[PDB]
């Protein structure tokens, strides 16, 4: 079990989304909390977590239960640049919005326009690396 240093980081960002001091967190913001430390879960990693931790149907999570999940899942910035450059055709480290837009809306974690539209505003042909400076 990791030294206290994480635990401090862990409790504050556990609490900060705890609605009114109870020690319980809604389902919807278990993701954001994790994200709020440096992670990158998917909705697959989430749902698998959710049912296993609680099948109560409560829609809550106390801090022991959240502690445990963390140890389990404990990737750098390069694991991102590969995951992006596969779509690049040129091999110049550029992809273009047209290309990127259609993919995201039809692949595994499909986005609605809202999420996607933020992408289009985000930068610039867009640049593969440019986003990563922002990305991380």
């Amino acid at each position: 079990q990791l030294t206290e240093e994480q635990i401090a980081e862990f409790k504050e960002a556990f609490s900060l989304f705890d609605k009114d001091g109870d020690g319980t967190i809604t389902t919807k913001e278990l993701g954001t909390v994790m994200r709020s430390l440096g992670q990158n879960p998917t909705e697959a990693e989430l749902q698998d977590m959710i049912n296993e931790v609680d099948a109560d149907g409560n829609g809550t999570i106390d801090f022991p239960e959240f502690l445990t999940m963390m140890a389990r899942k404990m990737d750098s910035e390069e694991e991102i640049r590969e995951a992006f450059r596969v779509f690049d055709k040129d091999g110049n480290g550029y992809i273009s919005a047209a290309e990127l837009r259609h993919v995201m809306t039809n692949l595994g974690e499909k986005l609605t326009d809202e999420e996607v539209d933020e992408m289009i505003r985000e930068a610039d042909q867009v640049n593969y690396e440019e986003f990563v400076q922002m990305m991380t």
Binding site: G31, I80, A83, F84, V86, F87, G108, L111, M135
Partner: protein, 324 residues
């Protein structure tokens, strides 16, 4: 058989090759798209941390609100500073007659009271210095008129919105023979009136001219009387929605009665020029005048449905006003 069979092999490899290339693509995309949900997600957090900090910085500021300025109450203090100056700008007083000022934050009472005084003097200077001298004359004229009449005469109120003006009577109507006789005196105001004689109390149209020296009562061109301001003591009027007045004046003709269709105007304008402003009477009962010499007469006012002036065999002058 070998050719048929060989195809199966190649068939499988392509399927394997594209399929694995596809999965690689699907995987590589679920990586970034949801790793990015955790970029945006990690800001939803850090802005909800700032929000908590700001609330608390404010309340920490409040608890320390009696302290000299410092980083902690700097927020809170600047908030009351800010809030105040805004919430005043919204609620500033409409004019010189708005006493009203809003209640301030305890600390800035001292400032509130500086500002209120400053605003008022600003308002005073802004107004007095921007008024056009034309207009300044009108209000000044109107203002004396209210002083004289407001409350005391049943048609002063209706008079207010209809402006006062220079001469009521014509470029040409004054008849050159009278102007020559009139002399080196100018005409500050003229207006058509109706005279009623001492004995008969009969109607006679005339013109009333106001010169710096005197009032002059003029027939078509014959100048039938001059009353000096020294020789004119007072004016008397009824208290009803009437239109008529008497000029008090001292073996020569004396007081006289007249009707202006523009009564408030004429009467103030006169009393100003003649400096007999304080010397106007407003009677609710009856008016006494010296009359045509040796023939004293009395004027009896009464309310009614119409305007008419007539005499009745008491010898008195019976006036009947309308009534709004």
């Amino acid at each position: 058989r070998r050719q048929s069979l060989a195809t199966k092999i190649q068939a499988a490899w392509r399927g394997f090759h594209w399929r694995q290339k596809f999965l690689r693509v699907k995987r590589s995309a679920i990586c970034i798209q949801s790793w990015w949900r955790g970029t945006l997600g990690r800001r939803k957090a850090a802005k909800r941390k700032w929000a908590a900090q700001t609330i608390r910085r404010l309340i920490r500021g409040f608890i320390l609100r009696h302290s000299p300025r410092c980083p902690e109450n700097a927020f809170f203090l600047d908030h009351v500073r800010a809030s105040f100056l805004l919430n005043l700008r919204r609620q500033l007083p409409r004019n010189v007659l708005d006493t009203s000022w809003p209640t301030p934050p305890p600390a800035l009472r001292e400032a509130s009271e500086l500002l209120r005084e400053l605003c008022m003097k600003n308002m005073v200077w802004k107004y007095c210095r921007s008024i056009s001298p034309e207009w300044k004359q009108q209000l000044q004229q109107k203002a004396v008129a209210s002083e004289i009449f407001k409350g005391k005469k049943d048609n002063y109120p209706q008079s207010v919105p209809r402006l006062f003006i220079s001469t009521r009577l014509g470029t040409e109507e004054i008849s050159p023979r009278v102007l020559q006789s009139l002399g080196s005196e100018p005409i500050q105001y003229a207006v058509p009136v109706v005279k009623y004689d001492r004995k008969g109390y009969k109607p006679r149209p005339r013109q009333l001219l106001l010169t710096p020296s005197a009032v002059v009562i003029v027939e078509d061109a014959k100048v039938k009387q001059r009353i000096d301001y020294a020789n004119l003591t007072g004016i008397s009027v009824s208290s009803l929605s009437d239109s008529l007045f008497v000029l008090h004046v001292q073996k020569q003709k004396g007081d006289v009665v007249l009707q202006s269709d523009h009564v408030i105007e004429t009467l103030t304008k006169t009393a100003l020029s003649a400096d007999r402003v304080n010397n106007i009477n407003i009677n609710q009962g009856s008016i006494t005048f010296a009359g045509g010499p040796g023939r004293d007469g009395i004027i009896d006012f009464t309310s009614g449905s119409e305007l008419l002036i007539t005499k009745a065999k008491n010898g008195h002058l019976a006036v009947v006003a309308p009534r709004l």
